């Protein structure tokens, strides 16, 4: 299997409220474990998962330093983007950054990440080669040009290949009683007699972790995506997740429909009928 250590960073300008609100959120798989908030009572990197609470003082001050360093660059960045797009300085704007590594089961690096978006749209991304960029306007080609000239990728690619991996490696091994856990979904189908004379079959999956799951409906071995409504996987709030998928079936032909459930925690995929 594969795992990951991802950092989600946000900087939102606020001309009418003061300097930019800046935050950093760290994750190991679908598990937040660290957070930095500009607007806190005393901004510092804080633990959001008990397995990271086993880190020394150096760890919380080093990350706080790194977060404090980062925010300065983002304030700058925000203003540079203003110039690049010719926009007014009264409008709240956003710069997001996602950086991290997905490593395989052999320990090797499956993929390295380091991208940004400005106002919710892609801006500039470190290709999977971890050497060249990719932009999609003519303002981020300015950024591509700028950074390409400087040799940015090397240092970035050194963090994705080096430190990210070891720290993930350490986090994975130190959070094994949570991170390492696979809870299979409990599944069941409900029956909903519709006013139109037909039935809505609802396939549920509850209590699963990780959040990755696949739910499908079938008709005598036939994937019916036309007829299938599914909701976005959501959290129960306790570390587990939930999801459902529905299909409208003619009343009396229910027997013939099947819900298939694929999850890592399941020995074999489940197949359910009403």
């Amino acid at each position: 299997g594969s795992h990951s250590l991802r950092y989600f960073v946000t900087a939102v300008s606020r001309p009418g409220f003061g300097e930019p609100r800046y935050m950093e959120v760290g994750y190991v798989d679908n598990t937040e474990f660290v957070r930095f908030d500009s607007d806190a009572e005393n901004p510092r990197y804080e633990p959001r998962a008990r397995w990271i609470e086993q880190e020394g003082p150096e760890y919380w001050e080093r990350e706080t330093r790194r977060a404090k360093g980062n925010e300065q660059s983002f304030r700058v960045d925000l203003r540079t983007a203003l110039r690049y797009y010719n926009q007014s300085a009264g409008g709240s704007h956003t710069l997001q950054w996602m950086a991290g590594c997905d490593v395989e089961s052999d320990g090797r690096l499956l993929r390295g990440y380091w991208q940004f978006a400005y106002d919710g749209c892609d801006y500039i991304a470190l290709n999977e080669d971890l050497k060249t960029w990719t932009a999609a306007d003519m303002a981020a080609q300015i950024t591509r040009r700028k950074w390409e000239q400087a040799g940015a990728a090397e240092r970035d690619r050194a963090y994705l290949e080096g430190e990210c991996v070891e720290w993930l490696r350490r986090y994975l091994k130190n959070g094994n009683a949570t991170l390492l856990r696979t809870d299979p979904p409990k599944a069941h189908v409900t029956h909903h007699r519709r006013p139109e004379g037909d039935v809505t079959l609802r396939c549920w999956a509850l209590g699963f972790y990780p959040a990755d799951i696949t739910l499908t409906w079938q008709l005598n071995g036939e994937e019916l995506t036309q007829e299938m409504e599914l909701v976005e996987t959501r959290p129960a709030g306790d570390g587990t997740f939930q999801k459902w998928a529905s299909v409208v079936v003619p009343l009396g032909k229910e027997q013939k429909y099947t819900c298939h459930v694929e999850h890592e925690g399941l020995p074999e995929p489940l197949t359910l009928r009403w």
Binding site: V34, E63, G69, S73, I124
Partner: peptide, 10 residues
Amino acid sequence: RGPGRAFVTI
């Protein structure tokens, strides 16, 4: 451990 901007701006 998180990534550093290294003061390389946009």
